[PDB]
């Protein structure tokens, strides 16, 4: 499963993740301007559906998120309503 769909159920003080990246943002990466989870709140929301750290994220509520600024990519997850489906990307594995 190299693309996963994840359904967060919104609480009190968020979903329990940040993001890096998007375009003309500081990239998370060296290879990839996309926007990623770069932490995971051990034990918030997100973890507890499943998000993974480095997940890249792919789309949020249907607003697809591929090549999109960092600001769009906060501003959906913020303002997506009572759950949050979280289309993402997930590497097992990463070549150097």
């Known amino acids: ?11 009190t003080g ?10 003309g943002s500081t990239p998370y990466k060296g290879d990839d301007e996309g ?6 709140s051990e034990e918030g929301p997100a973890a507890r559906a499943g998000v993974r750290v480095g997940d890249k994220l792919l789309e949020v509520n249907g607003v697809a998120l591929q090549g999109a600024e960092h600001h769009e990519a906060v501003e959906a997850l913020r303002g997506a309503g009572t759950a ?11 070549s150097v």
């Open 35 to 40: 926007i990623f989870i770069s932490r995971v």
């Open 14 to 23: 968020g979903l329990g993740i940040s993001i890096a990246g998007g375009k």
């Open 1 to 11: 499963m190299e693309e996963l769909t994840l359904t967060i159920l919104r609480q």
């Open 84 to 94: 949050v489906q979280m289309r993402v990307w997930r590497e097992r594995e990463t």
